[PDB]
RNA sequence: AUCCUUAUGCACGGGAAAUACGCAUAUCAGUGAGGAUUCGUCCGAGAUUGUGUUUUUGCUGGUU
């Protein structure tokens, strides 16, 4: 389920593979925070910084090896 | 080819010739609109920076200086010349002419072969020197 | 390059310096005739040249701001490899 | 130190973590250890855990708050040490490690240090 | 006091390999690197990127 999300297919073919397993992970430490969370207030803010993480490591994946000097 | 620099007087001919004591001084010789000027200034431009150890690569022109022109006797196109501690360079490329070069050269790796016998046997005092592959044929 | 930069001679000659060695009526009528013959006898750049024109509207700032050196097939990799893998031969044995 | 977080509890003292982390790494050596966060539930899930340490100063600490739950129904004890960088090492591990659980082998060569650390830790629990 | 276990250090003796071993004012990385799957789940530490040397490094001896 996780394979058809967004934060995977905005991204090149050539870095799922690399964006599951790194997604999959905080998924569970956003899982993990919504049992922590009280029932009364829930509070968003860890997902910023794991999105921000995110995308900004997507990024860098795709970007490929600064030109080399001859 | 704005890789590689232009020489815009006689006078930095000689000196670029004399300053460097330990590569070849490639020069080519000819002029910016030729069809066979243009082609040689992409193949020497792709070599330049392997080989930047070894040799240094110059472009003049024959209009923009004509001094040069009676003395080494230059006609055609453009010509090639090897020059090491201000001693002009020879090389038999079985053309019937060993001074200088003037068919153009068809493969990367060719070229780079020449510029080295050059080097290897001119670092010897060896004024001439075979270059391997013989296009005679070709030019 | 540092010569390359200066730009002055003394007024001298190039040959000599180095070393160096090395390894009007008729006129007019010729003109005349030349001119005879005169009097008688791009694509791309086309292709072009439009959008050159459709480049003048940029600015300076976001011509500085330019990536500079992509490489997008990993050429560099590849090809160390490859000659780490092309080096040596070994032979085979008996 | 820092204000050690309210919710981290037990807090090992400075005489405890000296005697936990030596277990760590000397269990390492024999690969009866587990580290991370991941491993270490991994570990309570199937049941052969000792006990669980875990970083008292992870940041933010709820990301591993779920631990201490989940060893309650195991009936496994558990403790915080003050650092993680100090747990880094002890698994043999250059990086920050935040969570990890010894784990079961009645064979074992050091089996007498874990009860020994076991028997230490649940008196915290009160 | 003997004995036994693991880690680390110096070391005699015995092997194997150098297409291998490193280095970086550099990117991420158990807050999960990179994989396996009988599809239920299972292993858990390096992967990028640039680079140096790599039919050899130092040192002696014979014979001409
Ligand atoms: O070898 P040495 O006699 O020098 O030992 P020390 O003089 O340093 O002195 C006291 C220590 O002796 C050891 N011994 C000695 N014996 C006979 C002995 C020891 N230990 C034990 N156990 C503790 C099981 N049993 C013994 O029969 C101890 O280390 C003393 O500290």
């Known amino acids: 389920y996780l394979f058809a999300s967004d934060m995977i297919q905005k991204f090149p073919v050539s870095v799922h593979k690399q964006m599951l397993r790194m997604l999959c992970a905080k998924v569970s430490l956003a899982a993990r925070v919504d049992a922590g969370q009280k029932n009364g207030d829930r509070n968003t803010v860890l997902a910023h910084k794991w999105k921000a993480e995110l995308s900004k490591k997507a990024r860098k994946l795709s970007e490929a090896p600064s030109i080399s000097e001859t | 080819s704005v890789l590689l620099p232009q020489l815009r007087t006689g006078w930095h001919v000689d000196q670029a010739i004399v300053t460097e004591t330990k590569r070849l001084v490639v020069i080519r010789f000819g002029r910016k609109n030729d069809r066979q000027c243009m082609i040689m200034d992409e193949l020497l431009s792709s070599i330049a920076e392997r080989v930047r150890n070894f040799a240094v690569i110059y472009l003049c022109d024959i209009d923009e200086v004509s001094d040069f022109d009676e003395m080494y006797e230059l006609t055609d196109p453009m010509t090639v010349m090897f020059f090491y501690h201000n001693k002009h360079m020879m090389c038999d490329f079985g053309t019937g002419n060993n001074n200088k070069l003037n068919f153009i050269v068809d493969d990367k790796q060719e070229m780079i072969d020449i510029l080295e016998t050059i080097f290897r046997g001119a670092r010897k005092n060896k004024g001439l020197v075979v270059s391997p592959y013989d296009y005679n044929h070709k030019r | ?94 | 130190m820092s204000a050690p977080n309210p919710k981290a509890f037990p807090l090992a003292d400075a005489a405890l973590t000296q005697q936990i982390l030596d277990v760590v790494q000397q269990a390492a050596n024999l690969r009866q250890l587990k580290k991370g966060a991941n491993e270490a539930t991994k570990t309570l899930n199937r049941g052969i855990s000792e006990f669980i340490i875990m970083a008292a100063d992870c940041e933010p600490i709820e990301i591993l708050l779920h631990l201490p739950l989940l060893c309650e129904d195991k009936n496994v004890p558990y403790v915080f040490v003050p650092s993680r960088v100090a747990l880094g090492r002890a698994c043999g591990v250059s990086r920050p490690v935040i969570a990890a659980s010894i784990t079961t082998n009645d064979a074992s060569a050091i089996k007498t240090q874990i009860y020994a650390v076991k028997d230490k830790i649940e008196t915290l629990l009160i």
Not at chain 3, 8 to 25: C, D, E, L, S
Not at chain 3, 65 to 85: C, G, S, W
Not at chain 3, 87 to 92: E, G
């Open chain 3, 1 to 94: 390059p540092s010569f390359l930069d200066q730009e002055p001679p003394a007024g001298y000659v190039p040959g000599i310096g180095r070393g160096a060695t090395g390894f009007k009526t008729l006129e007019l009528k010729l003109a005349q005739k030349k001119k005879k013959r005169a009097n008688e006898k791009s694509n791309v750049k086309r292709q072009f040249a439009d959008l050159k024109e459709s480049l003048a509207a940029v600015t300076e700032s976001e011509w500085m701001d330019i990536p500079d050196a992509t490489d997008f097939t990993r050429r560099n990799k590849r090809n160390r490899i490859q000659e780490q893998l092309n080096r040596k031969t070994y032979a085979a044995p008996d």
